Structure 1
Amino acid sequence: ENRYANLIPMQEIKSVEQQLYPFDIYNSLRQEAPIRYDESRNCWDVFDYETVKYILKNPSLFSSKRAMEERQESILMMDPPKHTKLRNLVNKAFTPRAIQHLEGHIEEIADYLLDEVSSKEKFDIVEDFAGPLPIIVIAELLGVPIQDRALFKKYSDDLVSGAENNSDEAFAKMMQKRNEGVIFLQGYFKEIIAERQQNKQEDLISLLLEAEIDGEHLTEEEVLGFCILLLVAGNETTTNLITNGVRYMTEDVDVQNEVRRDISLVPNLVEETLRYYPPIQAIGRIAAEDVELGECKIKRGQQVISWAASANRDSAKFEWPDTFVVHRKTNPHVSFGFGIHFCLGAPLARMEGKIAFTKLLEKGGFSKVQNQSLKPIDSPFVFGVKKYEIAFN
């Protein structure tokens, strides 16, 4: 069928171990052919850094309109000029300057979460820390109560899940799970939107209902698209940033110790986690016209999957591509994308990661619980684990 290839795993990724560390496979594929058509998924894969960046930089050539006849009327799936107008509503809300005032409060949220576990021998960094903290932050930004964090996590995670394979049964099981998260989350936000239409508040949702574009209010679908995209993007990725950073720091305790002993290295650590364990592995696009990249001729309308996970380790751009380095003078990864769709939340994600890692490090040395069976999140464009247990020494 005409299915989104970014939800369907490559055939080159087979075992669970490979899902937990697919980067050697991506590097082999990059070397064999940095651009290849995958007949199992009816798409091109692009693995090299230069071409990924070129795709993201050329929205006129590679369109973001890739909704799978799905309910995603958000800027993520829009092209200029509509993308420009809707994004200009929110861009000033997510700058470094706009968020600086949240620093103390995010530190307070992290302190409170680590207090719920101080007297716990071992704990799940996902359930007890990395999961809650991003959800709490984005809910306060949106103006939405989320006191049942586990409920919203479940359905937010649903909207990112992919297919086990390219079969018909796997795709149907995937759409069933995605549809459940749409029902609850669309419904919840429709109710909050109606509540804000009746009585405005000092929150993002209320601002979106007052804002005018081309002399008219936003459609309900458009406000809903903002609400869900901001919710899901705001928490699912950031949780994997924190978890993946804690994963690497308990796989390589040398790095953990170094950064704990020189806390000014936390920003580099955040960037290197994003490069080395990118929460988002692949970004989709649709060819807007025929495009000749190499010898490879991309025909208008074909799916084009750009692998940030591979671009981040392209040795043509990165020294020591497969080594975790906390002393890099620059780190031009594409884990937040590039160009007009560049991650709106990157300053917020970077602040949350910086505070999350700092609070963990300051609480002392910590180790992974050995003899656990890690479970990768079931989505091929995501990289993270469902659970990750650690303990303080």
Structure 2
Amino acid sequence: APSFPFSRASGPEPPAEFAKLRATNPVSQVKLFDGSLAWLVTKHKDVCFVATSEKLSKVRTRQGFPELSASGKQAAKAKPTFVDMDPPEHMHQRSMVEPTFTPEAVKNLQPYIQRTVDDLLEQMKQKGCANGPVDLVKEFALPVPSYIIYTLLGVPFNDLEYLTQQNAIRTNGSSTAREASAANQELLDYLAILVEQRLVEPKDDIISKLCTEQVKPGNIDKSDAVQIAFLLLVAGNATMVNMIALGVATLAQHPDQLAQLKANPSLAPQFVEELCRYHTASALAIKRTAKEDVMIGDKLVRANEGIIASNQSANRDEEVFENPDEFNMNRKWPPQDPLGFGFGDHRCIAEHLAKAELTTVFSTLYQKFPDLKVAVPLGKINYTPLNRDVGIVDLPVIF
């Protein structure tokens, strides 16, 4: 049994193991950091099965749950939020914050998403690059998702810049464990104050909705509200930042497609669809433990055994996506859903918001800066460590 997680084949590539497994051993056992074994599912059909099977559980207190790191095992001891719940607890809590994320709500949020992106681009423009390249991540990829989620949660405008930086410290590879935890606790402390404030004078934000609709009636307590808000903040922010950076690098990598997008920003939606399939920046989030024996392919997964379903591998499944390793914004899509945002009841609560943010970014970025260029050889791009989810740490650009 090979050690898992696997390392990316290269900066922008998925682990080399997946293609081989899909072809010769689609359901196999891997060895986790603690020596425990877990089942790795690599084919699209099987990943979808794992994502929806009622015989599987997301509860982390079940022995056999596939924790991939030492820190992961420790976090599993805290009270859980809906991300780690099974029905009926799952939807009971998730439905408390879903309203803001519905397709309809996101459609109505479009003008706000657009102005947020416009303002950040204008700021990046006036900041210019006369004295050299600027870091697209720091100046744009990071603040876009950050300002939007913080604003939705209820953070006032003047606190956005500082809070965006602190949340980034949580996941920056450079941060020491102390700095990372300090930033973590600080954000939690801050949200605690927001909850107290909104309980007294509710405003138009997620935190206020939680306070008025759930805390006051006694459905959840103040700390629960803080944790739910915290989950919404940290769940996908870093992923969003990476997706934006990865999108820019990919366009640089394939000049012809950037030409097409520039000539027709209306292609943004399809470019984003291909991007979320090709670059599956969240690939270790579909995990379960079998509540009872379950057969998957030619294997029997016994009760209490763990399962990791790779949506990254599923997104490269040649049986579903023709020429899977080819990035093609004009790809002819099959009826099967690409899995960048997961599948089933737990499917990313912010999928529509995330896609709206990316679509807005890629339908505007090159309109603002038609000559935007990565200021370093693409082969020199600073990607996230190979033993982590795909992403980009910094991206120098000129325009």
Instruction: Output the TM-score relative to the length of structure 1.
Output: 0.85
SS of match in other structure, 1:297: strand
Given the alignment, which residue of 22, 41, 46 partners 2:41? Answer: 46
**2:194 corresponds to:** 192
Offset of 1:181 from its aligned partner?
4.0
1:10 — aligned with what?
4
Q: Which amino acid aligns with 2:50?
A: I
Q: 1:155 to 1:382 in 2, by over 3 A?
A: farther
- In the TM superposition, residue 277 of structure 1 has moved relative to its aligned partner by 0.7
1:131-158 per-residue CA deviation (whole Å, 9 max, x = no partner) reads 1011111111111236455654455356
Q: Equivalent residue of 1:211, what SS?
A: helix
Give the equivalent residue in structure 1 for 2:67: none
Q: Which residue of 2 aligns with 1:68?
A: 73
Task: Determine the structure 2 residue equivalent to 1:129.
Answer: 140
1:161 and 1:115 mapped to 2: Cα distance? Answer: 26
**Residue number in structure 2 paired with 1:319:** 322
Shift of 1:380: 4.8
Q: Paired residue for 1:97, among 100, 104, 118?
A: 104
Deviation of the 1:281 alpha carbon: 1.6
Offset, 1:19: 4.8
Equivalent position to 1:365, from 346, 354, 371: 371
> Which letter maps to 1:201?
K
Question: Of 240, 256, 276, which aligns to 1:238?
Answer: 240
The Cα of 1:227 is off from its aligned counterpart by 0.6
1:304 counterpart SS class:
strand
Q: 2:177 & 2:302 partners in 1: Cα distance?
A: 28
Q: Take 1:68 and 1:154, find their aligned partners in 2: how far apart are those partners? A: 27
Match of 2:22 among 23, 27, 30: 30
Partner SS state of residue 285, structure 1: strand
Please, which runs of 5 or more residues in structure 2 have no aligned partner? 61-71
TM-score (normalizing by structure 2):
0.84
Structure 1 unaligned blocks of 5 or more: 1-7, 163-172
Separation in 2 of the partners of 1:299 and 1:150? Answer: 49
Aligned AA for 1:258?
Answer: Q
**CA distance, structure 2, for counterparts of residue 300 and residue 138 of structure 1:** 38
Give the distance between the partners of 2:167 and 2:386, measured in 1 at CA: 13
1:51 Cα offset (Å) = 0.7
Q: In 2, Cα distance between the equivalents of 1:141 and 1:303?
A: 35
Q: Distance in 2 between matches of 1:103 and 1:85?
A: 28
Q: Quick check: 1:304 aligned with 2:291?
A: no
The whole-number CA distance in structure 1 between the counterparts of 2:256 and 2:223 is 49
RMSD: 2.9
Greater shift, 225-234 or 73-82, is seen at 225-234
Work out the CA distance in 1 between the residues paired with 2:42 and 2:178. Answer: 31
Equivalent position SS for 2:239: helix
Contact kept in structure 2, 1:209 and 1:217, CA below 8 Å: no
Report what 2:149 is aligned to: 138
Q: SS at the partner of 2:398? A: strand
**8 A contact 2:191–2:226 mirrored in 1:** yes
Give the Å deviation of 1:23: 4.5
- Post-superposition CA distance 1:165-212 (Å, at most 9, x none): xxxxxxxx9975663343222212112112222322222111111224
